[PDB]
Design a protein around this ligand. Structure first.
Ligand SMILES: [Br-]
Ligand SMILES: [Br-]
Ligand SMILES: [Br-]
Ligand SMILES: [Br-]
Ligand SMILES: [Br-]
Ligand SMILES: [Br-]
Ligand SMILES: [Br-]
Ligand SMILES: [Br-]
Length: 132
């Protein structure tokens, strides 16, 4: 039902090929603040921030209303590790905000053998990001 899963580099490529494509960071405010965020300044646009889950881990029941308010064709959804963003992509799709894509591996990726993230995901592949 949602348009597809794309890897972090594919997401960057899609944004770079489509001036009206939108990156929606759906992580909670605590992750934006303490972990960091993608940086689209080199593409002359802003990231759209709408929490899927709030920082207590529970769903933002105003997500759709906020999403429709805050966007800006392709709309690309980014979570911590690529999994909870599928729900956001499905909500976008059902709202006719399409094509809606999910970023595999997310911003931080999976927990590796040492109990560390930063192995896969947006930052691991060095796509533009900032935490100050
Ligand atoms: Br679609
Ligand atoms: Br990749
Ligand atoms: Br476009
Ligand atoms: Br979060
Ligand atoms: Br916070
Ligand atoms: Br925003
Ligand atoms: Br998320
Ligand atoms: Br994970």
């Amino acid at each position: 039902s949602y348009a597809g899963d794309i890897t972090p580099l594919q997401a960057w490529e899609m944004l770079s090929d489509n001036p009206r494509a939108v990156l929606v960071d759906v992580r909670c405010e605590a992750e934006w603040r303490f972990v960091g965020v993608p940086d689209l300044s080199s593409l002359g646009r802003e990231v759209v921030y709408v929490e899927w889950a709030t920082s207590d881990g529970t769903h933002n029941d105003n997500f759709l209303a906020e999403l429709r308010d805050r966007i800006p064709r392709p709309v690309i959804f980014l979570c911590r590790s690529g999994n909870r963003s599928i729900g956001a992509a499905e909500v976008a799709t059902e709202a006719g905000i399409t094509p809606a894509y999910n970023v595999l591996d997310g911003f931080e990726g999976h927990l590796d053998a040492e109990g560390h993230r930063g192995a896969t995901g947006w930052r691991a592949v060095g796509l533009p990001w900032r935490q100050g």
